[PDB]
Amino acid sequence: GHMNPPPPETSNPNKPKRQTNQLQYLLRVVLKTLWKHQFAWPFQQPVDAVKLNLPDYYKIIKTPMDMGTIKKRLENNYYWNAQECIQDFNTMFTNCYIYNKPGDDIVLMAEALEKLFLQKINELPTE
Ligand SMILES: Cc1cc(S(=O)(=O)Nc2ccc3c(c2)CN(C)C(=O)N3)ccc1F
Secondary structure, X not given: OOOOOOOOOOOXXXXXXXXXXXXHHHHHHHHHHHHOOOOOHHHOOOOOOOOOOOOOHHHHOOOOOOHHHHHHHHHOXXXXXHHHHHHHHXXXXXXXXXXXXXXXXXXXXXXXXXXXXXXXXXXXXXX
């Protein structure tokens, strides 16, 4: 039958990780600002291709990422540096633009969240 893939890991004892003021800002300011946006909801958890009737999603998107995963990674101090976390946000946005049709509602939502994201990481503290 239909199935979702296992979600991205939010812990890995053998991964190198650190706490930095930039990673604290990425949770406290960036993630928590985007999370409260009226367009956040499709991005707050891994895509449930079964319940959302998107059977092609994991045929097209092979590096899934979502803000639920990013939130848990930040809370778990999973990252080595801010760049690793920013890369996860960028993967999430890129996947949306690859999978969905330009001008569709999901793309308008991603565009609005990405506009905010780009503003917020411009005020990333110097480490
Ligand atoms: C805004 C919106 C959402 C949904 S849905 O949430 O019910 N299904 C859904 C439909 C498409 C997507 C996603 C969810 C999530 N996602 C990250 C993505 O890239 N595409 C369907 C139509 C639609 F216009």
